[PDB]
Every structure is written in structure tokens, then in C-alpha cells.
Design an enzyme around this catalytic site. Structure first.
Site, PDB file in Angstrom:
ATOM      1  N   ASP A 150      45.920  29.242  19.460  1.00  0.00           N
ATOM      2  CA  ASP A 150      47.230  29.766  19.054  1.00  0.00           C
ATOM      3  C   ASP A 150      47.411  31.288  19.250  1.00  0.00           C
ATOM      4  O   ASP A 150      48.519  31.748  19.539  1.00  0.00           O
ATOM      5  CB  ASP A 150      47.502  29.382  17.587  1.00  0.00           C
ATOM      6  CG  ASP A 150      47.546  27.861  17.360  1.00  0.00           C
ATOM      7  OD1 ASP A 150      47.688  27.103  18.347  1.00  0.00           O
ATOM      8  OD2 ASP A 150      47.440  27.419  16.193  1.00  0.00           O
ATOM      9  N   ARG A 452      43.795  47.512  55.343  1.00  0.00           N
ATOM     10  CA  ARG A 452      42.897  48.530  54.823  1.00  0.00           C
ATOM     11  C   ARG A 452      43.139  49.892  55.398  1.00  0.00           C
ATOM     12  O   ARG A 452      42.623  50.881  54.873  1.00  0.00           O
ATOM     13  CB  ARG A 452      41.450  48.152  55.114  1.00  0.00           C
ATOM     14  CG  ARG A 452      40.971  46.984  54.282  1.00  0.00           C
ATOM     15  CD  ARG A 452      39.573  46.624  54.708  1.00  0.00           C
ATOM     16  NE  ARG A 452      39.012  45.527  53.960  1.00  0.00           N
ATOM     17  CZ  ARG A 452      38.607  45.622  52.697  1.00  0.00           C
ATOM     18  NH1 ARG A 452      38.709  46.761  52.000  1.00  0.00           N
ATOM     19  NH2 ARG A 452      38.086  44.549  52.126  1.00  0.00           N
TER      20      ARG A 452
HETATM   21  O1  LIG Z   1      35.912  45.652  47.478  1.00  0.00           O
HETATM   22  P1  LIG Z   1      37.161  45.839  48.293  1.00  0.00           P
HETATM   23  O2  LIG Z   1      36.915  46.809  49.411  1.00  0.00           O
HETATM   24  O3  LIG Z   1      38.276  46.237  47.348  1.00  0.00           O
HETATM   25  O4  LIG Z   1      37.557  44.475  48.978  1.00  0.00           O
HETATM   26  C1  LIG Z   1      37.502  43.280  48.267  1.00  0.00           C
HETATM   27  C2  LIG Z   1      37.055  42.214  49.245  1.00  0.00           C
HETATM   28  O5  LIG Z   1      36.382  42.765  50.376  1.00  0.00           O
HETATM   29  C3  LIG Z   1      35.071  42.233  50.537  1.00  0.00           C
HETATM   30  O6  LIG Z   1      34.024  43.233  50.405  1.00  0.00           O
HETATM   31  C4  LIG Z   1      35.009  41.510  51.898  1.00  0.00           C
HETATM   32  O7  LIG Z   1      35.674  42.246  52.918  1.00  0.00           O
HETATM   33  P2  LIG Z   1      36.839  41.603  53.840  1.00  0.00           P
HETATM   34  O8  LIG Z   1      37.921  41.028  52.938  1.00  0.00           O
HETATM   35  O9  LIG Z   1      37.300  42.695  54.775  1.00  0.00           O
HETATM   36  O10 LIG Z   1      36.280  40.471  54.624  1.00  0.00           O
HETATM   37  C5  LIG Z   1      34.823  41.329  49.333  1.00  0.00           C
HETATM   38  O11 LIG Z   1      33.779  41.800  48.507  1.00  0.00           O
HETATM   39  C6  LIG Z   1      36.113  41.259  48.535  1.00  0.00           C
HETATM   40  O12 LIG Z   1      36.700  39.975  48.535  1.00  0.00           O
HETATM   41  O1  LIG Z   2      44.550  18.694  16.184  1.00  0.00           O
HETATM   42  P1  LIG Z   2      45.791  18.421  15.358  1.00  0.00           P
HETATM   43  O2  LIG Z   2      45.387  17.919  14.003  1.00  0.00           O
HETATM   44  O3  LIG Z   2      46.843  17.612  16.062  1.00  0.00           O
HETATM   45  O4  LIG Z   2      46.547  19.816  15.056  1.00  0.00           O
HETATM   46  C1  LIG Z   2      47.461  20.346  16.011  1.00  0.00           C
HETATM   47  C2  LIG Z   2      47.665  21.834  15.771  1.00  0.00           C
HETATM   48  O5  LIG Z   2      46.408  22.530  15.818  1.00  0.00           O
HETATM   49  C3  LIG Z   2      46.410  23.613  16.777  1.00  0.00           C
HETATM   50  O6  LIG Z   2      45.468  23.399  17.841  1.00  0.00           O
HETATM   51  C4  LIG Z   2      46.110  24.937  16.054  1.00  0.00           C
HETATM   52  O7  LIG Z   2      44.718  25.278  15.908  1.00  0.00           O
HETATM   53  C5  LIG Z   2      47.794  23.612  17.414  1.00  0.00           C
HETATM   54  O8  LIG Z   2      47.670  23.426  18.810  1.00  0.00           O
HETATM   55  C6  LIG Z   2      48.565  22.449  16.836  1.00  0.00           C
HETATM   56  O9  LIG Z   2      49.784  22.935  16.286  1.00  0.00           O
END
Ligand SMILES: O=P(O)(O)OC[C@H]1O[C@](O)(COP(=O)(O)O)[C@@H](O)[C@@H]1O
Ligand SMILES: O=P(O)(O)OC[C@H]1O[C@](O)(CO)[C@@H](O)[C@@H]1O
Ligand SMILES: Nc1ncnc2c1ncn2[C@@H]1O[C@H](COP(=O)(O)OP(=O)(O)O)[C@@H](O)[C@H]1O
Ligand SMILES: O=P(O)(O)OC[C@H]1O[C@](O)(COP(=O)(O)O)[C@@H](O)[C@@H]1O
Lengths: 725, 120, 704
Positions: A150, A452
Site C-alpha cells: 500500500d 554518443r
Molecule cells: O556506460 P555508458 O557509456 O553510459 O553506456 C551504457 C551502455 O554502453 C555499454 O558500455 C555498451 O556500449 P554500446 O551500447 O556502445 O554497445 C554498456 O555497458 C551499457 O549498456
Molecule cells: O488479503 P486480504 O485479506 O484480501 O486484504 C486485502 C487488503 O490488504 C492489502 O494487501 C493491504 O496490506 C490491500 O491490498 C487490500 O486492501
């Protein structure tokens, strides 16, 4: 001795929390007991209370629910029950309690601490020796952790619940598309609206109904007008999110069925209602929830050790990404006061009491859902440009969407630049409007395109385009190259006046290596992909037995993904650049793992950041573990690669993208109501706060050789991997 | 590093370990000598070994032919064994051979291993 | 010219079906038009009918409509129709074909030239595809099981009973196959009502579960569940009943339209593609003498069923349902429906122990090879069928490794509870073969009085059987009935067209390929080279390639050279001129010793310079996967049950025919002596000599 239990509705991440309490407990040299079935197990005693060993909590963290069970126990609300409960604890020498539950479970623990005087009735009755009444007296330390989806009271399970809701929304969107339909979705949050609000924000919902903030009179027409506008705009579906406890300014319930009747009556559109139900409490914990629960578990144990009789019962929490202990009594009072305000119809107060970020989500949601007619928006004569720079990152499209719509709402004209500085130099620039960015929030990748390449060698062509398109400000959504870009443009101001405008960047990158921010848009998505992939690899290893996986992750020199992924996946080790390691460190983990193969849990998982060492490569490690593991275990290596980037952004990355960009646009508009260092900034997250920092001031804080920040908040968590494995 | 001395502890592995743990004190280079080791002109020892041992094998062949085969003793390795060149039936060499790694079980020169410690 | 449209309820895979009709159409040299908004778009005409190119991928119930519809088609020269929909849409097309000769009213009115009435007359070929095995079922089932798996964690916590309403007002197939797939405690179907006294029977089952310490119950209820009197059985009444009789904590969840949503599974994409290609072919081959058909998949073959007959069939089931010919209803749903139903009931309801007639036999169950999703379901099914047949079931742990070490323990009905949706191998699995441990294993068989052996596993399971067969002369302990079911992600077991786990892997590959394509929008002009598992078996790379829309999939079973490579690079280079600037190349891991994943990456990179760049990714052991797909759960369950029946039957009575592979072969599950499979096997590469799916290789060229 420590007792841990779970009470109230279950929430994903509870098992992680329990895991961390047991393992931190044992690591500090305490004994830890599971108490099954919440308070009822405490009352019933017997086999419902069991001591927990290191092995008892393996294979648990990646699973929803609580493996030790939870229950609404009426017997604990009675004096008779608590007496027996208190007795059962004393038999096991348990004077330290960790309770994981909601509003009710914690009020129960509050009450139990007050009445720990119950020990005297134990004296008056046969119950206990007098020595016991003195030995365990007011020596009841209680620490609470909140576990409700919640957010009734950040809470464990909220992020997971939100993944659940958005999975359902994303699935529904393909079927609503076909022909045309409006969907009314009832989500959880008995008297809390956080989930509905944040889901609405995360999916670009057409309307939302919250308990904290009722609709206001005339909403019926306003809503129907919005839906008619959508059909005229050709939008092939509507999504309306409704909190379980949505209500009238008169506190009358607004039900999903009434909403359906209203739409069918007024507009005659094809409408269906889906009550998500208990699915929202289920499924696997997200990466965020596992990490949150782990940090909270560890912090709860520490709180108990440090507690005195003079110290009050606390609830461990996360405020501004720091572990804090809040007085339990004060928190209980707070929760009543919100309900009070709701009952008295002081709805503004209700929203005030929910906190700063609640009102932030709410205002941002409305701003992006409801466009004032053009005539109403005064307009000012600025053109503001939006761009993506660096590798693609999940949440970039949500970010563009938000920036564009806030810009238009502020009466600017929005220009989209395509393909980063590459397109910028080539004049790939076009006006973009409110309708253009419709539906982007849940879209992975970069729709504008991102590159880049840096501006430095194209300063004249770019200056020309700014002049040509009369560009008054620039928002850059991107990574480290975005930051380098800003540095270059700042330096180029003296030779080119066209750059003497306000410029700001928000961090978007899977790597989380942008100086000035603790988080970057996309990294949560990547973590969730890594975590899911590791869950699978671990299963594969547990099927074979006596196997260790060596897994290479992304991040560049930035250890964030390997480290946080390691924690969320329950890895035994995570080698990163930011922490030198030598052959002794490696040998030591091998020896540890070899010991672990004598237990039941005959698997291992070792993560290696891709650039953590020039000599100690993924193969090197694979070879060492393999050779020194001979006769005990074997290894496999896997380089996860580009699939880590993941696909559609997680709810966190959607909302981060949306919110942070909105904030950057406000700053741009404000600057334009008026050039030096303070007009070229990174808008980043810094412990509870989002802040604008001049790029000139960030240079000192940056390692340019390895493209990482000098100070990284998450390195304080390194001890957790040792402990939790 | 003998090329097949270990499946995991490769030439790169060792290069990496010595590099990393030598940091601040020394650096490394690696080299795989390769097929040059096969080639070139033979040394005087290999010329004369080739010559003398083959001559000896031919004498044995001649001698066996004067008898004119099915014995184990007509299929042999002419090898050097401590001061002697001797004809050994291939059937008798099987017990003395590691077929998986294609090496003899007993290798005379292993008694010299302590010398490298001492002499470096 | 060909017109394609979608009608009735939507189903995941429809877009794949359409994709395949357009591309096969164009490839065959026809013109293809999209018809939007189903029949209405046909009636409205205009922009609702649009020609489709390579890059792209009430009023009908009245005579007045059909007249306009027929006219719109004739304007575009469209006499070939492909309709993708349900019962109603296809009956509509049936009707439209009958009335085509009312081109004459077009003549009588100004409508059309007489030449037209003769030129397009009774030249209406109609082919149908069902979209409501039918396209979308597998996807819907993934949807349901995702929800059930999520609900299981929360029911666990609270010792709770869940009543889940799933789709099917008329058909019960989804509820049945979901129940089977999640080990549900009870199921309610329209075709088969409960029978009187069910209320007590159900409550008894739930009480038994609590006594067994099961922390939750799951009851699946079809939307149109009914009593033998055709009264609705609602989810609310089921809840009232449980709360009343047992007082357990009970909640109801109506899944709703989520079941129609989400992304298409790998199976649905591939099924839709094969159906699309087959629909086009049917149209080409059709004559005026030829009746309208519906393309279908029967026994993994593409078949054309007369449309009229299929319509009649559908009515007949509803007719039987009306008068409580409930047996007839089930009969009409087909052999595999009754199969699912009997297998479900066998595994859900245990007769009391006194009731079950005892054999004196001990039957052993084991996992051999790498882990494969669905292995636990398989063990569960085999164990429970074994116990139901009055055997004692022995679990061997860690394959032949544990077998040689005597890691053997009796296992019961309750022990395997909840396994159905569990990935990995809970017993443990190893690759090691029995050959060097024959004496130690013989000893354990003797020690534990083992009368039969079921092996769930891969190619090593098969080799293992060969070794044990050969060892019979020296060890009498192996003169027992032995059978294996195929479990492996690779699908390389001789004697089976499918293996348990491969669907799960396909879905992982497919989902990973989708994700990569969702990222990367930013650079455009990029090609991913992706290495998949499978050993020398190309099944995963090939079927994954199809499901993912890859541009190429290099496999061992089809040699390729540098010319073939240069040629696909040139093709992709051309494709970068178009709008669709993102390429996907799959490479089976062992497809070539020299042409490695890096090699290919390097060639495509170098020859793509100035046009596109590449990334490589080796997917790795994630493909072994996490939780099994519904198909793998149910395959595991069903095939193992069948193997256990064979074991029990053999024990009511050793040579070649007692050591078998139970595999799938063209519509049939059949027991094949391992001795007969040797000739059909390539032992060097551990793959079958003949692989059914290679006939599909042309599809990737066409559909890319
Ligand atoms: O770390 P940066 O330079 O922000 O880039 C993030 C992405 O680049 C990478 O180093 C890979 O490079 P490329 O996307 O150019 O292939 C990954 O680690 C990552 O998904
Ligand atoms: O699991 P029960 O008894 O249906 O209770 C539902 C209520 O409990 C909750 O999970 C709250 O913790 C809500 O999602 C919901 O209002
Ligand atoms: N005021 C209270 N006094 C004593 N116990 C309480 C109280 N409120 C809740 N509990 C305990 O918590 C359980 C129900 O939790 P609930 O009130 O649903 O809050 P939550 O589920 O949010 O923790 C009951 O079993 C009861 O034992
Ligand atoms: O094809 P097999 O030998 O039956 O095994 C299936 C699995 O084995 C693999 O070849 C991997 O083997 P390892 O697990 O020993 O490294 C994969 O192709 C596949 O997931």
C-alpha cells in the site's frame, strides 16, 4: 536471541527481509528464531517457533510472499493471547523482536511493548520465576519493518506491486488497441492512493481516482470531455485507474462499476472493468524491493543490538536513501491522523500528510494528463530544444514526453532534435507537440534517436542550427557524453553566443555513472533484467549441483550494476573497478565457495563488472575458480551483453524519467524569466533531494579517465554482499 | 611454460598474474615461440644422432632378414636407455606409456628438476 | 489479388499470420490487400482496403452489405480471401461464398459489366484461419499461468484458497489445460459438468490437502461452467461453498481481458507463420471445384479442412451441450481433449490407499543430462501415475552419479506436490554415463529391488539406455523394462520431434530478441549477432529465428560458406535503405568451427562499414531457463504419464522392445526401441539424421 515474524498482508520482498535479519543476526553472533504464521504462531508457540540457520534462508529471496507465513490473529488482540505470546518468547530467551508487516501489525507491537508489564501477571500466576520478571523486564526491544504494497505509512513490496500493475496494463493495452475500448482498472491501496497514483503516472492513464484527493464536482463531465477528445485525437484506447477506496468529496465511494456506467451512458463507448486483485501482492520481488528489504533487514538487526531500555521501539526506514530509525509510536499516530483528516474531509491535509513526493507525483500526473485549451495558455516566445545523447536507456521516451508537455503547458514552443549531436549538426530538428509524444511513457529505446558523438568538432554547424531555429534553451536527456557535451558547449560560449542560453541535463543511462546523480534513468530496468537472468542461471546451477557461474555485467568502469545486481541476485561475490582486489581476495572467495559445497546449497554465483581489471578478466577468474575448484565444483562463464539494457522501462524508470524531466523544464522556464556557470547544470538526485549542479563544479568530482564519479554512495553497501551470502 | 602444462593456467593466465602482482615492481611480456622450434637446420647432435641411430636400425633389419614375421620382437622401438641403445618391442612399451597425454610414464630428466631452483 | 482480414475476438499471433499471408502472397507473385476493421472495412470500402507491400509487415449480416462488399472486392480485382477469425467470422465467409453468384444482382443493377459477372464468377476462393490448435491459445495460456504463478506466492503466505475464473463461455480447453499446467485442485468445464455429489468430493479433496499440509488451494473455473442441468456454476457459489463447508479463507479472481493480451508466445508466432504460408498456398492451388477450406495443424502437418464441415462440427457440439450429451460434447472436442481431461483427473485425485490394487513392483525415476524446464512436472506425473497404478516409486538423485552412489529413496504422492511449475531439476541431473559404473549400478538395482526405470533426459539418457541394453548379458539386473522421455532445451533426441524444455528456451530467446529490438531504437542501423544454445542441433536457432523475425540463422545442419555470408551482408545492406533499419542474425553455437560468433561479427562489421554497425551477444545458460512454459509443463506431464502406463503394462507379463524412447513422431507418441534408433542417429554430433523442422528453412527467407 532474536525473533522475526511477518504479519498483515504479504508483500514481495518479505523473504529477502527475513533472509537479511537471519544472516545479519547470525553474523553478529545472535541466535535467530523464525516465528511462523505471524502473531498467531507467537500465541500458539511450539513448533511455530523455530531456530534458523544460515542454510534455512537460501532459495528464498527471489520468491514472492513470506516463506514463514503471515496471518490476522484475533488471539493477539486479546490480553489472554499476549500473555501466552509473552510466555512462549521467554521460554526461548527471546527479548528481541523484529516485526515485518503493515499499520496493524506494528500498532500490535507498539501495544505489546507497553504491556510488557504482562510479565508481572506471569509472576502473580504460576507463569514465571520472579528472577525472570526482573531478568527480561523492559528488555523487550522491538524493531518494525513495513511490508505492505500500500505504502500506507518507501515500503517493501510497493515497487513489486507496481511492476505487477504495469505488467497488467501493458498486456491490456494490446487488446484495447484492437477495434477501440476503454478500460477501468481497480488497483489496491485500501485507504492509500499511492499505488494508483504512481501506476497512472507510469502508464499515462487518462484518469485516476484517489482516496486522498477526491475528484471535485463536475468531474463526470470533465472526464467524459477528456475521453471524447481522445477519440477525436484517434487514440484507440482509454485507461482509467481507480483506487479500491476512491471516494467523493462527500466520502461516498466511487466504484469501478459506476465509472463504467457513466462512460457507457454518456459516451456509449465499449467499456470493461478489471479488478486486478491479489495478483498485485504476488509474483517475484523486483530488484529494488530485494535490495530495499536487504538493507532494512540489516538495519533492523543493528537497531536491536544498539537499543537500550531508554530507547523507544523504532521502525527502520529509508529516508533519502539513508537508513533511519523512526519512533514507532510517532509513526502509528501519523497514520491515524491521515485517516482523521480524510474523515473530517480536510483533503488538502491528507495530501500534505502523505509527504512531499506524493504531492509531486500528483501535480506531475495532472500536468501531463490534462492540457488546457491553447487559447488559455498565454505563450511566451521561446523555443526549447530536447535531445538524447549517449547509448539508449529505458525511460528516455517517458522523459521526452514529460519535457515536451511541460514545455507546452508553460507556453514554449518545443523542438525535437533527432540523433543527438549528430542530428543537431545536420539540422535534424522539428517542432513537436502534445499529441506527438502520446503513448511514449512505456516505450523502451530512444524514439528521437541517440548517439554518443560529442559536439566539440561540430560547434559551428550546431551554433548555426541554434541561430537558424532561434533556440532559447536546451534539455539533454543522456549519459556521461551528455555531461561532456555540456562542458564543451560551456567552453564554447565565448566564441559562439548561440550557446549563451540556459542548458540542463537529466541523467539517463543503464550504467548510473553520471556525476551529480545517485540514480540514472534506465539503471533499474537493467537491474531487473540482470536479476531475472541471474535467477535463471542459479536455477540451472542448482539443477546440476556443484557449479559456479562467473557472469560478466555491463556498466563500464561503473560498478553499480554488478554490485546492486549481485545483492539482488544473492551472488557470492561481485568484482568491481572501484574496489581493488588481488589474488588473495580471489583465492579467499574460492575457499569460501569450496566450503559452501559441503552444505546443501551447492551453487555459486560470481559477478564481474566488465572493466573491473585489465589482467583479472572474466576468463582469468573462470580459470582460477575452475582449477582450484577441481574435484569440488565446476564453472561456466556467461557474458550477459546488450540484453542487460532490457526492453520496456520499469515503473521506476518511467516515473523517474517523467518526474525529473518535468523538473528540468520548470527550471528552464524559470531561467527564461530573467550567461554564467549556474546556467549549465546537471539535474541529479542527491540523498532525498533533486538538485541543479553547475557542470563546472562537477569536474572536480569526476574521474574523466574512467567516466565515473569520484564519490559513489552505494560503495557503503559493499559489506552487505559478504554478509548476505 | 610448456604449451599444454595446464588447461586453465594458460600462457595468458600466467602473464596476467605476474603482471598484476608485479605491479609497481616489474612488467611482463608474453611470447609464444611457435613452429620456428621445428625448423632450421639440425644441430650437429641431431645430425649425428639421426645418422648413427638409423644406421643401427638398418643393421637390425638386415639381421632379422637373414633369418628368412609374427613375434612381438620383430616390431620394435630403437631407443636410447641409460648408456645403451636398445630394441624394445612395442607391446612391452604399452605399459610404460601414457596414451592420453602421449608421453612416457617415466622420464629420466625429471630428476633434474631441483637444479633450476638451485641454479636460478 | 488477395484480400486478408481479421474478424471476431482478437488473439495474440494475428499479426504474425497477416505478416505471413502478405509475404507469401507477394513472393508467389500475387498482390495483397489489407482489409481493415474486418468485414465492416470490406463493406465500407475506400481507404479501409489498402495494398500491402513487403515493408508493411452488422452490415455484413445483411444482403445489402454483402452486395457492396462484393463490389468493393471486384473494383480491386480481389477474388481471393483469407479470413482470420472465430466461429462467426468463418460462417460469414461460408455464407459469402454461397451467395457469390449474386454477382448477378450486380449485373441487374448497374453494378458491373457482364464480362465481370463471368470473369470473377465462382472464382471466389476463400481460405480461413482460426484466431480465437488455434492461434492465440498458447499465448492466453502463458497469460493465465503467469497470473496463477503470481497468486501462488500470496496464497502460500496466508494458507488460502483461490477461485480463478478464466475464459471460455463455450469451450473449456483453456481452463482444462491451465488446470493441468498449474496442478489445480479442481476444474470446472462447460463440456464436462461435475456430476452430482461434486460439492462433497471437492470439499473432501480440500480437507485432504490441508491434512497433507498444502498451504493453498487453486480452483480454476471456466466462464461458462455449468451443472448437468445447465445451471451456471459461478466462482462466487464456489467461494460460498468452501467458506460454508470448510470455513477456509477464500478469495475470487476474475482474470478478464488480460488473457487476450500481452505478447505472442514463440509457439503462436511460429504457428501463425506456418498457417499464413499454408493459407496462401491453399488459395493458389484452389479450383472452382475445390471447396472453401480452413488451414490447420494436425500432427504437426499443414492440412486443409473443408470449411462447411467445420462449421457444422461447431454447431453439433453446442447441440450436444444443449441436451446433456455431455459425453458427446467431449467426444466432439477430439482425442487430445479427453487425453488432457483423464490425465488431469489422474493427477489431481488420489484414491484412498486401501482402494488401490497393489503390484509388488518398485519403479525408479531419474533425470539425466543438462537441466531442462519441465523435468519436475515430468517426475511429478510419473510418480503419481506410478502410485495410482499400485507401484512403489523410487527417486534416484543426481542421475547415474547418484545411482552409482546409491542416492535412492522412496517418494510419494505428497512429495511431488507443487512441482509442476518448477524449473530446473529437483532430483538433480548429471551428464555422466553408466558405462564405467555398471557394477555399482547393478548392485543398487538389486539392493533396492528395482523392477523398471523411467529416465527423463537428453541425448545422454539415450546413450545410457544403449549402454544398459548392451550390459544385459553380463548383468541380469538390467533385464527390466526401461523407457526414456526426452527432456532438453536442444531438441536433439532421436525418436522425438519435440523435447521437454525447448519451448521454454524458445520463449526466452524470443523474449530476449524482442527486448534487444525495443532498446537500440536510438542508433538505428544496427545488426545484432546472437549465439544460441543447442549444441549441433539447430532447432533453437532456427525456430527462434522464425519467432523473432531474424534475417538469418546459421546452423550446423546447413553448411554455409563465405559466399553465403557475403550474400546475407549484401541483403542486409540493401535493407538499411528501407525504413526497417535493424537486423538480427542468430548463430547456433556449434554451427561451424571456424565461422564463430566473433568471425561473423567481424565480417558483418567490416563489410557493413558506413551502413550499419554490429553487436554480439551470447545468450548463455539463461536459456536452460527459469520456470517452464505451459507447453513444457504439460508436455512433461502428459508424456511421462504415458511412459508410466507403458511400464505398468510391460510389468503385467527381456529383448529390444523393452528398452525404448517414448517420442513424438508426426501426430503420434510412439515407443521406439533404442536399437532401432541407432541407424537414425548421428553420434558424432549428437543429433538425429532426419529433422522434421528443416523443411521450414525456406520460411525465414520469405518472412524475414
Ligand atoms: O556506460 P555508458 O557509456 O553510459 O553506456 C551504457 C551502455 O554502453 C555499454 O558500455 C555498451 O556500449 P554500446 O551500447 O556502445 O554497445 C554498456 O555497458 C551499457 O549498456
Ligand atoms: O488479503 P486480504 O485479506 O484480501 O486484504 C486485502 C487488503 O490488504 C492489502 O494487501 C493491504 O496490506 C490491500 O491490498 C487490500 O486492501
Ligand atoms: N490494534 C491492535 N492491537 C493488537 N494487535 C493488532 C492491532 N492491529 C493489528 N494487530 C495484529 O495485526 C494483524 C492484522 O494486521 P492488520 O490490522 O491487517 O494490519 P496490516 O495487515 O497492515 O499489518 C492481526 O492478526 C493482529 O494480531
Ligand atoms: O544439448 P544437450 O547436451 O542435451 O544439453 C542441453 C544444454 O547443454 C548445453 O549444450 C550446455 O552444456 P553445459 O551445461 O555443460 O555447459 C546447451 O546447449 C543446452 O542448454
Amino acid at each position: 536471541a532474536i525473533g522475526v515474524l511477518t504479519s498483515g498482508g504479504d508483500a514481495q520482498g518479505m523473504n529477502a527481509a527475513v533472509r537479511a535479519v537471519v544472516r545479519m543476526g547470525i553474523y553478529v553472533g545472535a541466535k535467530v528464531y523464525f516465528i511462523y504464521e505471524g502473531y498467531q504462531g507467537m500465541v500458539d508457540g511450539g513448533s511455530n517457533i523455530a531456530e534458523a540457520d544460515w542454510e534455512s534462508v537460501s532459495s528464498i529471496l527471489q520468491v514472492g510472499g513470506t516463506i514463514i507465513g503471515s496471518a490476522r490473529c484475533q488471539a493477539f488482540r486479546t490480553r489472554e493471547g499476549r500473555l501466552k505470546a509473552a510466555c512462549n518468547l521467554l521460554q526461548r530467551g527471546i527479548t528481541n523482536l523484529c516485526v515485518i508487516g503493515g499499520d496493524g501489525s506494528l500498532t500490535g507491537a507498539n501495544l505489546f511493548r507497553k504491556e510488557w508489564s504482562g510479565l508481572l501477571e506471569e509472576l502473580a500466576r504460576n507463569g514465571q520465576i520472579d528472577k525472570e520478571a526482573v531478568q527480561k523486564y523492559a528488555y523487550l526491544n522491538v524493531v518494525g519493518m513495513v511490508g505492505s504494497i500500500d505504502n500506507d505509512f518507501m515500503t517493501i513490496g510497493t515497487d513489486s506491486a507496481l511492476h505487477r500493475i504495469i505488467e497488467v496494463v501493458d498486456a491490456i493495452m494490446t487488446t484495447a488497441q484492437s477495434h477501440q475500448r476503454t478500460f477501468v482498472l481497480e488497483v489496491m491501496g485500501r485507504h492509500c492512493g499511492y499505488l494508483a497514483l504512481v501506476s497512472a503516472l507510469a502508464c499515462g492513464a487518462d484518469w485516476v481516482f484517489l482516496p486522498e484527493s477526491p475528484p471535485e464536482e463536475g468531474w463526470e463531465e470533465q472526464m467524459c470531455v477528456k475521453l471524447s477528445e481522445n477519440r477525436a485525437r484517434k487514440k484507440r484506447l482509454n485507461i482509467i485507474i481507480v483506487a479500491e477506496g476512491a471516494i467523493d468529496t462527500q466520502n461516498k465511494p466511487i466504484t469501478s462499476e459506476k465509472i463504467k456506467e457513466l462512460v457507457v451512458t454518456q459516451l456509449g463507448y465499449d467499456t470493461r472493468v478489471t479488478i486486478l486483485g491479489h495478483v498485485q501482492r504476488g509474483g517475484t520481488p523486483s530488484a529494488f524491493d530485494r535490495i530495499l528489504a536487504s538493507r532494512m533487514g540489516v538495519e533492523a538487526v543493528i537497531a536491536l543490538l544498539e537499543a537500550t531500555p531508554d530507547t523507544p521501539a523504532c521502525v527502520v526506514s529509508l529516508n533519502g536513501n539513508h537508513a533511519v530509525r523512526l519512533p514507532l509510536m510517532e509513526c502509528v499516530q501519523m497514520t491515524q491522523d491521515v485517516q482523521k483528516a480524510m474523515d473530517e474531509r480536510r483533503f488538502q491535509d491528507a495530501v500534505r500528510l502523505r509527504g512531499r513526493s506524493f504531492a509531486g507525483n500528483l501535480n506531475t500526473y495532472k500536468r501531463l494528463a490534462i492540457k488546457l485549451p491553447d487559447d488559455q495558455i498565454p505563450k511566451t516566445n521561446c523555443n526549447v530544444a530536447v535531445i538524447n545523447v549517449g547509448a539508449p536507456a529505458a525511460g528516455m521516451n517517458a522523459a521526452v514526453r514529460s519535457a515536451v508537455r511541460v514545455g507546452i503547458a508553460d507556453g514554449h514552443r518545443m523542438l525535437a532534435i533527432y540523433d543527438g549531436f549528430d542530428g543537431f549538426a545536420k539540422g535534424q530538428i522539428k517542432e513537436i507537440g502534445w499529441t506527438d509524444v502520446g503513448g511514449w511513457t512505456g516505450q523502451g529505446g530512444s524514439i528521437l534517436g541517440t548517439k554518443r558523438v560529442l559536439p566539440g568538432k561540430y560547434l559551428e554547424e550546431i551554433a548555426t542550427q541554434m541561430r537558424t531555429h532561434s533556440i532559447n534553451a536546451l534539455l539533454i536527456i543522456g549519459g556521461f557524453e551528455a555531461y561532456l557535451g555540456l562542458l564543451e558547449l560551456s567552453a564554447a560560449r565565448e566564441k559562439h553566443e548561440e550557446f549563451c542560453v540556459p542548458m540542463v541535463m537529466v541523467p539517463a543511462t543503464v550504467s548510473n555513472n553520471v556525476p551529480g546523480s545517485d540514480f540514472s534513468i534506465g539503471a533499474d530496468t537493467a537491474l531487473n533484467t540482470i536479476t531475472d537472468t541471474c535467477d535463471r542461471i542459479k536455477q540451472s546451477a542448482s539443477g546440476t549441483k556443484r557449479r559456479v557461474f562467473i557472469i560478466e555485467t555491463m556498466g563500464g568502469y561503473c560498478g553499480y550494476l554488478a554490485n546492486m545486481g549481485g545483492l539482488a541476485a544473492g551472488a557470492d561475490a561481485a568484482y568491481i573497478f572501484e574496489e581493488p582486489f588481488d589474488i588473495r581476495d580471489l583465492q579467499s572467495n574460492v575457499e569460501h565457495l569450496t566450503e559452501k559445497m559441503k552444505t546443501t546449497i551447492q551453487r555459486g554465483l560470481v559477478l564481474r563488472n566488465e572493466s573491473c581489471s585489465e589482467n583479472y578478466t572474466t576468463d582469468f577468474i573462470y580459470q582460477l575458480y575452475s582449477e582450484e575448484g577441481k574435484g569440488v565444483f565446476d564453472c561456466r562463464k556467461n557474458v550477459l551483453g546488450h540484453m542487460q539494457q532490457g526492453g520496456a522501462p520499469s515503473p521506476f524508470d518511467r516515473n523517474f524519467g517523467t518526474k525529473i524531466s518535468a523538473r528540468a523544464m520548470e527550471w528552464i522556464t524559470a531561467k527564461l524569466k530573467e550567461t554564467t556557470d549556474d546556467s549549465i547544470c546537471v539535474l541529479g538526485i542527491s540523498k532525498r533531494n533533486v538538485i541543479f549542479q553547475p557542470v563546472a563544479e562537477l569536474k572536480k568530482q569526476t574521474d574523466f579517465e574512467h567516466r565515473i564519479p569520484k564519490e559513489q554512495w552505494w560503495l557503503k553497501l559493499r559489506p552487505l554482499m559478504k554478509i548476505l551470502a | 611454460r610448456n604449451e599444454s602444462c595446464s588447461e586453465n593456467y594458460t600462457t595468458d593466465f600466467i602473464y596476467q598474474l605476474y603482471s598484476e602482482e608485479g605491479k609497481g615492481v616489474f612488467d611482463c611480456r608474453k611470447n609464444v615461440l611457435g613452429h620456428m622450434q621445428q625448423g632450421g637446420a639440425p644441430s650437429p647432435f641431431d645430425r649425428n644422432f639421426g645418422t648413427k641411430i638409423s644406421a643401427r636400425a638398418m643393421e637390425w633389419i638386415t639381421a632379422k632378414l637373414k633369418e628368412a614375421f609374427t613375434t612381438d620382437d620383430s616390431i620394435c622401438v630403437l631407443g636410447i636407455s641409460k648408456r645403451n641403445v636398445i630394441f624394445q618391442p612395442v607391446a612391452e612399451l604399452k605399459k610404460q606409456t601414457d596414451f592420453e597425454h602421449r608421453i612416457p610414464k617415466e622420464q629420466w630428466w625429471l630428476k633434474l628438476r631441483p637444479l633450476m631452483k638451485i641454479l636460478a
